[PDB]
Design a protein. Structure first.
Length: 121
């Protein structure tokens, strides 16, 4: 149908906008602390602590599968990255501190993306 195509063009454009949002968020992690999944070879007890792991490569795979239906789902994944880190790592660690800075710096980017998504429909 012509409607299914119009919907698909909207998802494609959302994916395009979320890709730019992801790139801007990932720039706020220059140490690449959140780039890849926590290694289960190197932290073998991780899943006993963290039930829903997340990281930027895993978000990118979902994005390119057009697996994000709205910005809320995207934000949920970003929030997982931060919140998992802030639980597993203690306050006085480079990892915790990196998450705090990512949260604070990302807020600005997510604030505007929410306006753009509402604005452009």
């Amino acid at each position: 149908s012509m409607e299914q195509v119009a919907m698909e063009l909207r998802l494609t454009e959302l994916t395009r906008l979320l890709r730019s949002v992801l790139d801007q968020l990932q720039d706020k992690d220059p140490a690449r602390i959140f780039a890849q999944p926590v290694s289960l070879k190197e932290v073998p007890d991780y899943l006993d602590h963290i039930k829903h792991p997340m990281d930027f490569a895993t978000m990118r795979k979902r994005l390119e599968a057009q697996g994000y239906k709205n910005l809320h789902e995207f934000e949920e994944d970003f929030d997982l990255i931060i919140d998992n880190c802030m639980k597993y790592n203690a306050r006085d660690t480079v990892f915790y501190r990196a998450a705090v800075r990512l949260r604070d710096q990302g807020g600005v980017v997510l604030r505007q993306a929410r306006r753009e998504v509402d604005s452009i429909g």
